[PDB]
């Protein structure tokens, strides 16, 4: 079925004194497509979408600082930490104009960068992105208790850091189809050492849920407003029931956002890339052929 291997040559770039691993494939002459993963994934999540796009466009898929095959310094791994490291990563590869393909926390990165560099973003494909969740009722009920547990300095760290629940439990619960043992091992590899699991816990404590953290809420609201006011070509993927984006919200945004094409990928939760990579890749490639890049 959905291939579990990772047939990509490892690329490394030094960013603020640390090395960041990244996938780099495709032609070098045009505009490149930058793939940003989230929590608790790596560039491995893009492994079955990239081969659809590589024939025609450059694919760049970094592992976030502290995750995947990137270096893992002793940082707090707040959202701002990733913002600094991703700005410096984009400048280290001398990328001028890019097309964004962003998911989960990568979306919060991508969108934020796009707000600060409007002339440099030729297109944004996004899925299960970070939006402001006004109350806990807008969070899916089946996960509502668990993320509330995750957002505590005592119980949450025992779950995510000591017992590694975000990798062993939450991650498969974010995919409709079952993850194979090879896939689980690939996702487990960067966090075999518990001390390296700080990012797995800080991200859910950065989620803009119920107005906290206030700075993250403001930051996210700002680029959501910028998105509602930008003419950038937009491609939005959504699934049922979803996690961050329920179908109702996706439908709303499909009309409220300028130049927005929506694509229903079928059953999905949060890692839509794992439930229907074929459709996402084919749609991204066809969408890319319609841009002026
Ligand atoms: Cl999270």
Author numbering: 3 to 295
The authors write:
HT7 was engineered from a bacterial dehalogenase (DhaA from Rhodococcus sp.), an enzyme that can hydrolyze halogenated alkanes. HT7 reacts specifically with chloroalkane-PEG (CA) molecules resulting in covalent bonding of the alkane chain to the reactive aspartate and release of a chloride ion. In addition to the conventional α/β-hydrolase topology, HT7 features an extra capping domain made of six α-helices (Hlx4–9) that partially cover the catalytic site and form an entry channel for the CA substrate. After reaction, the PEG-alkane ligand is buried in the protein, while the xanthene moiety of the dye lays on the distorted α-helix 8 (Hlx8) in a conformation partially constrained by the crystal packing. The alkane-fluorophore is positioned by the Hlx6–turn–Hlx7–turn–Hlx8 motif of the HT7 capping domain from which T172Hlx8 and, to a lesser extent, T148Hlx6 form hydrogen bonds with the oxygen and the nitrogen of the amide bond linking PEG-alkane and fluorophore. CA-TMR and CA-CPY have similar conformations in both structures with only minor differences in their torsion angles. In comparison to TMR, one of the additional methyl groups of CPY is forming van der Waals interactions at the protein surface, potentially explaining the increased affinity of CA-CPY relative to that of CA-TMR. The mechanism underlying the equilibrium shift from the spirocyclic nonfluorescent to the zwitterionic fluorescent form is not yet fully understood, but our results indicate that the planar, zwitterionic form of rhodamines (e.g., TMR and CPY) features energetically favorable interactions with the HT7 surface, thus potentially favoring this state of the fluorophore when attached to the protein.
The self-labeling protein tags (SLPs) HaloTag7, SNAP-tag, and CLIP-tag allow the covalent labeling of fusion proteins with synthetic molecules for applications in bioimaging and biotechnology. The three most popular SLPs are HaloTag7 (HT7),14 SNAP-tag (SNAP),15 and CLIP-tag (CLIP)16. To guide the selection of an SLP–substrate pair and provide guidelines for the design of substrates, we report a systematic and comparative study of the labeling kinetics and substrate specificities of HaloTag7, SNAP-tag, and CLIP-tag. We complement these kinetic studies by reporting crystal structures of HT7 and SNAP covalently labeled with rhodamine-based fluorophores, providing a detailed understanding of their substrate preferences.
